[PDB]
Structure formats: structure tokens, C-alpha cells
Scaffold this active site. Structure first.
Site, PDB file in Angstrom:
ATOM      1  N   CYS B 101       3.701  37.158  21.620  1.00 25.09           N
ATOM      2  CA  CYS B 101       3.628  35.932  21.242  1.00 25.09           C
ATOM      3  C   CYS B 101       3.857  35.838  19.719  1.00 25.09           C
ATOM      4  O   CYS B 101       4.476  37.093  18.754  1.00 25.09           O
ATOM      5  CB  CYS B 101       2.020  37.289  20.638  1.00 25.09           C
ATOM      6  N   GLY B 102       4.110  34.575  18.905  1.00 25.12           N
ATOM      7  CA  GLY B 102       5.034  34.639  17.917  1.00 25.12           C
ATOM      8  C   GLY B 102       4.015  35.459  16.907  1.00 25.12           C
ATOM      9  O   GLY B 102       4.630  35.270  15.742  1.00 25.12           O
ATOM     10  N   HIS B 103       2.798  34.490  16.662  1.00 27.44           N
ATOM     11  CA  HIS B 103       2.036  35.027  15.345  1.00 27.44           C
ATOM     12  C   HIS B 103       1.898  36.637  15.413  1.00 27.44           C
ATOM     13  O   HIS B 103       2.133  36.945  14.098  1.00 27.44           O
ATOM     14  CB  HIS B 103       1.134  34.272  15.101  1.00 27.44           C
ATOM     15  N   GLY B 258       4.765  29.357  16.573  1.00 29.62           N
ATOM     16  CA  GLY B 258       5.468  29.463  16.680  1.00 29.62           C
ATOM     17  C   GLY B 258       6.856  28.994  17.706  1.00 29.62           C
ATOM     18  O   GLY B 258       7.301  28.190  17.032  1.00 29.62           O
TER      19      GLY B 258
END
Lengths: 348, 336
Positions: B101-103, B258
Site C-alpha cells: 500500500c503506497g500511501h 502511487g
């Protein structure tokens, strides 16, 4: 790790951050964010004056608490005030994603329960009577208490009545729609869900929001919605789609589309009040008869016409609505003054 | 007399779970601090398996309404599992448990340095984080004891097509951990702004469906078209462009995705529109921003590929104490 998570628990924001504490509840799935502290003070000696002050001076804080990220499109709020009237225990102002409603059934059920459990009033068994100043008028709350615990909350609404009946409006984009319009502390247009090929179930969520807002705006541009005595009260709050009941003893189903596309996950406490007035004037229920109405997620309220009355020149009822609410959180909200979204965002 | 509600304490048999809430370019992350039951296991995957199999009702109590909402995300922080990690993480959201999960990675880097999970280093703190997908390396830029930026390297990203579908819509298709079709918003008379929210969803979904039915989206090893990303002109002169990602069945990313930036960098590099060293700034529908930069050329399967770097910041918005009433019939939430 596990142990230095303690550093996040001990962490305190800088002194220039705003800190707003709340107590959160839900009533039949529908939330209430109750503000406790950190809010600036709200001058005025009537509830409508207090509500007028909020819209003009502090509305960025309504968006900081109601909207994402703190926050979401269906969040609802309540500010509790010292009582305005001589017989009241306290006063209340409601807030949602667009603004400030004139009355709110699900919040009143939650407020009676929190008042007993958390000490706004003293507990009495078997029933605690609370009287509460709301924007629409005085609300009488009857709290059922056994052995120091709240079991169910009832309230009596302001007089509820019909304003128009069996109209048709042309909704540009939809066509011709039949509706009734009644008052239950707020104004709602009542519309039949199969008659527009929708069902009051989650499966149709976005179409209900979509069609519901179209119906609301069309009526608002075309018809006058008038409260007999108060200016700030004279507007269409929402569209309520009526549906076939799913469960055995339930009368029908409600999906309320209100404010800026908001959906009530409870049946609407004010919506049940207005619906009782509608059922009564076309004689579908008798005085004293209790009905059960469900919501889109299958939760339920009870409703009952307690008394006939006169309100202005209208034929009207005093409705009794009942339900339950549960405490779900204690929140400390942090507003960083450098945060690019400190007062929230909302996409419709 | 509101102080009485302020004084009120839940009965002690109630489960009480405290969290710290953040947003990363508008996307939330709920970080669990205490009150959660033990999650045994010697790997992150084992701990993740224990959570899904035994404690999933607690994911819904925190992610789902009334305590959460359809867009909520969560993170459980664990003891490190590998010899070099600083801590471990399990990701959580409304549908399940993501592997990356980028954020969330950005929010975790920011909270760790600001709130004391790891020690602050200037100008850069290295965080190594045991995740379900493997070890993740986070870089936090710190000046004067305050966090300025969080960046990481994403998986190798590559271009897949540079094509047409039918009005008639021009698109590129690239992978940045997920597959996206990139379309120019102004070329179809839309703008990447809130006034256009419903048309972006509406037009975005039609494009996605048309492309899916007509072109085969194949990952070299294990896929499908995740979403449409509309490209828009930047609002700020120092911003490269704007992203609005329409994904799943009409979901909208309020960050500049992202994985979307990663896929975007691959397309920009292959068109010669950016150089290996240059960082670009991409905005979202609500004006929040990520940075992107090609770190390296690389190869992925038989494709030319890039290693992308994505950067951003997160802001603390709440310290919440969640209460579970044992009589509450919706104590484990609902999903609408």
C-alpha cells in the site's frame, strides 16, 4: 514493535494545533459525532440564533469534523448547548455534510441514551423524561431504564403534518414522478421506489442517491416549502424513497436522501414522523397503533401517532418514534494549521 | 455539564482499541496502538493468516461503518520479524488485506520518525519494514527535527500499449504494480477537478470497460486492467500534471495513485519525456501531490522497465479511542 507503539500513545501534538474531542454513537447504523470540547463558543439565546451563528462564522469546523478525512460523506454531528427554554435540560444543533438540519430523529435517540448513561441528567426508573430544545422546537425524550442501563429511547416530535399530497413533478433526466410532501421536524418528499424501478436495498445505493437528489432539486426549484411560523425552517431537506418491507412485522422501508447526497443508514426519525402524518391523513393507521419501519441496511425504528393536533392552519399529529443507540468511540481530533486538508474535502 | 461526558469511561469489560489516524494526500490510514489481541506467528504472512482467520471481525469493527467507512485503511504494527527490520506491518482495508500500500508506506514513515517508532536521523532516516510482500525500505527526509518527505522505490514498472479504442479515445497502458490506462482529460472535454467528479467516474468506467473487452492485459507471471487514470494540466506551475484514477467499480483515488505514478514514469521515460534523474510532481483531484522519479533502468521479464521512486507526506488528524459495546448488534460494522 509492540513496545514502542507506546511512543505513539504518549505522543502529543504541538500547542498551536486545534484539539476537538467528541463522543461518537450510532443509531440503527447512522452515526452521531457529539462535540465535547475545543469548539469556540456560540453566542445567541435561541437555537435558531445559535445555528445561524455557526453557518456564518464556524462552518469550516463543521467541514473539519463532518467531512473526510475525519470525516466522511455520511457523517452526522451534534453540538449540545445550555437550554434556551425554561423547562429544558439542554439544547442541540445538528450538522451534516451540507449544513445544519432543523431536527434529527436518530440523534435524539442517541442523545437521550447518552444523557442517561453519561450524566447530562439523573437516571430514573423505569422512565427518564428529558426535554430538549431543538431548531424545530421542544423535544420530549422518554428514556427506558432498567437497573441503571438504557434499554430503548422514545421521543415525541414537534407537530408533524402533510404539506402537499399526490403531486407529480417532472424531474429532468427521469420523467414524471408522483410524490407526497410532509413535515416531521424537517421537510421530506415521499416517493415510491418501484414506481421508478429502484429498490430500497444496498444494490441500488448510487441510483437512490442519484435519483433522490434529482427529485429533491426539481421540487425545490418549482414549489414553495413553507413552515407556518419560522423562516429558517422553510426548505426541502430530502427525498425519502418508500419500499416494500423485508421482515415479518415491518410496515415498510425508508431510504432518506438528504443534504448533499447524504444517505441515512437508519430509518429517518424525522422521516417516520412525517410518514406517520401521511399514513394518518389518508387513514391508513389509527391513533395508538405502533408500526415498524426499516432502513436500507435492515435496521428498524418504531412509530406511533400519539395525538391529533392543530399546527398553524394544518391538520397535524404528535408522533412517537423509538429506537436504540450504542456508543462506539471517544475521539480526539487534531487540526494541524499547516495541514493542506485541515478543514476537509468533499466530492459529489 | 458536557464535562460529565468528557469524564465518562466505558465499563471495563468493554474492548477498547486506540488508534492514531493520518491522511496521505487525502487517503486515510488508521494505525492500531493498543487494546488489540495478540497476533501470534513468526512471519508476517503467518501473523496475517492468524488475523484473517481469527480476528477478521475486528478488522470490520475498525474499517467498516460506523467507526470507519468505505474508504478507510488500517495498519497493524508488529515486532520486526527479520534481523534487520525496525518493525513489521500488516495492511488492512474494507475488502481485506493488501500486500502493499503506497500511501500507507508514506504515512508509516512519517509517523515512525515524528512519533518515535525509530530514531530520527538527519538528513535521512532509513526505515526497513517487514511487510506481507517482503522487506520495504522507506526513506524519510528530516530537517530540524521535522519530517519533510517520505519516499520509497516501487516494483519495476513498464509500458504495455500506446493505442486506440472507441467517441474515439487515445490511451497508453502501463504497469506500476497494477495496470492502468492513461487518457488525456482535456482531449475528451473533462477536467481533473471536483466540478467534474461524476463525469470522470462515468467516462472513466466506460473507457475501462471498452478497453477490457477489446485488449488482453497480461502480466508476465501472474492479470487485468485495474483502472483508468485521467491526465490533466497542473494547477501549480511547478507541478508536472494531474492524475484522477477511476478504479474497480467506480472508485476514485483522491491521492495521485502511487502505483499510478510508477506506471506514469515508465510511460514518460519510454517516450523520452523525462530523464533518469528528474523528479516530477503530480497532483490529484483535490490538489494533493506526490513526487515521482525514475531511479534506474531495469528489465522485467522480456520488457524494458524502470525502478520508480514515489514520494509524499502525511498529516496526523486524530487520536481515537474505539469502544465496542457487547450489546451492540452492529459492533462489527456494516458495509454500504
Amino acid at each position: 514493535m509492540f513496545k514502542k507503539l507506546e511512543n505513539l500513545e504518549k505522543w502529543e501534538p504541538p500547542k498551536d494545533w486545534m484539539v476537538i474531542k467528541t463522543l461518537d454513537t450510532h443509531t440503527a447504523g447512522e452515526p452521531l459525532r457529539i462535540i465535547l470540547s475545543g469548539f469556540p463558543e456560540i453566542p445567541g439565546k435561541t437555537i435558531l440564533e445559535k445555528r445561524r451563528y455557526l453557518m456564518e462564522n464556524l462552518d469550516h469546523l463543521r467541514k473539519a469534523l463532518m467531512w473526510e478525512p475525519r470525516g466522511h460523506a455520511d457523517m452526522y454531528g451534534a453540538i449540545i448547548t445550555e437550554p434556551v427554554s425554561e423547562e429544558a435540560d439542554f439544547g442541540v444543533i445538528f450538522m451534516h455534510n451540507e449544513g445544519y438540519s432543523t431536527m434529527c430523529g436518530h440523534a435524539t435517540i442517541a442523545l437521550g441514551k447518552v444523557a442517561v448513561e453519561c450524566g447530562l441528567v439523573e437516571a430514573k426508573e423505569p422512565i427518564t423524561e428529558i426535554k430538549m430544545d431543538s431548531p424545530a422546537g421542544l423535544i420530549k425524550i422518554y428514556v427506558k431504564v432498567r437497573d441503571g442501563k438504557v434499554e430503548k429511547v422514545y421521543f415525541h416530535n414537534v407537530p408533524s403534518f402533510v404539506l402537499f399530497k399526490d403531486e407529480t413533478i417532472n424531474v429532468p433526466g427521469i420523467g414524471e414522478v408522483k410524490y407526497d410532501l410532509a413535515y416531521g421536524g424537517a421537510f421530506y418528499a415521499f416517493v415510491n421506489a418501484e414506481e421508478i424501478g429502484l429498490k430500497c436495498t444496498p444494490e441500488y445505493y448510487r441510483q437512490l442517491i442519484d435519483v433522490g437528489m434529482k427529485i429533491k432539486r426539481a421540487i425545490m426549484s418549482e414549489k414553495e416549502i413553507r413552515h407556518p411560523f419560522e423562516e429558517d425552517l422553510s426548505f426541502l431537506y430530502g427525498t425519502i424513497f418508500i419500499g416494500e418491507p423485508e421482515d415479518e412485522n415491518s410496515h415498510s422501508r425508508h431510504v432518506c436522501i438528504f443534504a448533499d447526497g447524504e444517505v441515512d443508514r437508519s430509518p429517518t426519525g424525522t422521516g417516520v414522523s412525517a410518514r406517520l402524518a401521511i399514513l394518518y391523513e389518508k387513514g391508513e393507521i389509527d391513533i395508538g397503533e405502533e408500526i415498524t419501519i426499516e432502513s436500507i441496511i435492515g435496521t428498524k425504528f418504531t412509530g406511533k401517532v400519539v395525538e391529533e393536533t392543530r399546527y398553524g392552519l394544518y391538520r397535524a399529529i404528535i408522533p412517537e418514534v423509538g429506537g436504540n443507540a450504542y456508543i462506539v468511540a471517544k475521539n480526539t481530533f487534531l487540526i494541524d494549521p499547516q495541514d493542506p486538508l485541515k478543514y476537509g474535502f468533499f466530492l459529489r
